[PDB]
Amino acid sequence: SQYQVGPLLGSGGFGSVYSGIRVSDNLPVAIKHVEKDRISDWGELPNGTRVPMEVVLLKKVSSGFSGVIRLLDWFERPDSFVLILERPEPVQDLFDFITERGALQEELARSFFWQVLEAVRHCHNCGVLHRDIKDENILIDLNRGELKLIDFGSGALLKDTVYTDFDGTRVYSPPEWIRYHRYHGRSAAVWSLGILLYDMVCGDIPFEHDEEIIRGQVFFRQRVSSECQHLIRWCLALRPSDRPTFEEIQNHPWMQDVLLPQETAEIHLH
Numbered sequence: 001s002q003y004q005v006g007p008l009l010g011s012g013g014f015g016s017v018y019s020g021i022r023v024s025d026n027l028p029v030a031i032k033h034v035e036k037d038r039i040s041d042w043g044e045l046p047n048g049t050r051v052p053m054e055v056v057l058l059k060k061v062s063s064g065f066s067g068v069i070r071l072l073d074w075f076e077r078p079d080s081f082v083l084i085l086e087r088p089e090p091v092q093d094l095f096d097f098i099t100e101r102g103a104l105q106e107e108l109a110r111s112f113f114w115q116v117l118e119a120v121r122h123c124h125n126c127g128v129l130h131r132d133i134k135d136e137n138i139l140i141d142l143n144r145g146e147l148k149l150i151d152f153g154s155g156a157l158l159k160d161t162v163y164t165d166f167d168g169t170r171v172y173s174p175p176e177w178i179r180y181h182r183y184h185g186r187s188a189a190v191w192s193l194g195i196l197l198y199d200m201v202c203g204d205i206p207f208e209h210d211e212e213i214i215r216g217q218v219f220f221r222q223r224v225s226s227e228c229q230h231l232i233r234w235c236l237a238l239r240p241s242d243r244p245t246f247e248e249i250q251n252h253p254w255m256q257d258v259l260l261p262q263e264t265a266e267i268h269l270h
């Protein structure tokens with residue numbers, strides 16, 4: 001109809017995501033089908049329409065520019081919703097990027113981690129909590145060296161009280177969720193960011209089983225600088241209140257002198 005459907009990009013119990021092209025102007029898009037009976041949490045537009053929470057969250061952040069994917073349009077069907085999302089081209093998610101390249105140089109990890117921090121800060125400033133930050137949910141604009149957060153289907157409105165639901169990725173979930181099924185938004189996000197940063201500089205996640213998450217002992221399987229190890233272990237503090245704020249992360253000595261996105265593309269991507 002309005003969009004030329006291309007190949008399937010991924011699928012799950014939630015639904016299916018296709019590559020697409022907007023017919024009117026040949027704009028690259030992603031077409032995300034969301035099964036109604038599998039929606040974790042429902043949202044509501046100001047006009048009262050019940051929609052998947054991802055629609056609400058994306059609209060709250062889909063303003064101006066940021067490192068968050070833009071929701072271009074959305075439709076409702078009898079049994080599903082259809083989301084039209086921005087699609088960079090060429091693109092590769094961070095999972096495939098690390099799989100092909102192995103552990104990233106710290107200069108490159110610094111650039112990527114900084115951009116993720118800026119994107120997560122933007123979400124929180126807009127009252128949005130992603131709840132599934134991980135390499136698979138980060139797209140790399142290979143030409144511009146810019147990263148973009150994707151998939152808010154596990155997200156929620158940001159609040160200052162405790163969350164008791166979680167449908168994100170378990171190996172990125174904090175020990176307080178594993179033990180008590182309870183967490184606060186910001187400190188749980190910082191934990192996932194610690195997992196992500198370890199993943200970038202070591203080429204794999206640090207914990208596989210619940211017992212390792214609860215123990216919280218970080219072993220580095222790759223050569224990693226002392227400053228980077230410190231930031232990782234700080235983000236992965238067992239006590240949530242011991243974890244750094246976003247400001248403390250970006251003011252950490254390891255985060256100084258970040259490359260610009262285009263510089264990052266020139267040195268590491270082209």
Ligand SMILES: COc1ccc2c(c1CN1CCNCC1)O/C(=C\c1c[nH]c3ccccc13)C2=O
Nearest residue numbers: 009010011012017030085086087093136150151
């Ligand atoms: C199971 O696979 C999923 C699940 C959820 C989403 C999704 C995908 C497809 N891949 C899977 C592997 N990692 C990257 C995403 O894509 C999304 C949004 C996208 C927005 N614009 C894009 C452009 C290019 C590819 C993707 C998207 C999602 O929410």
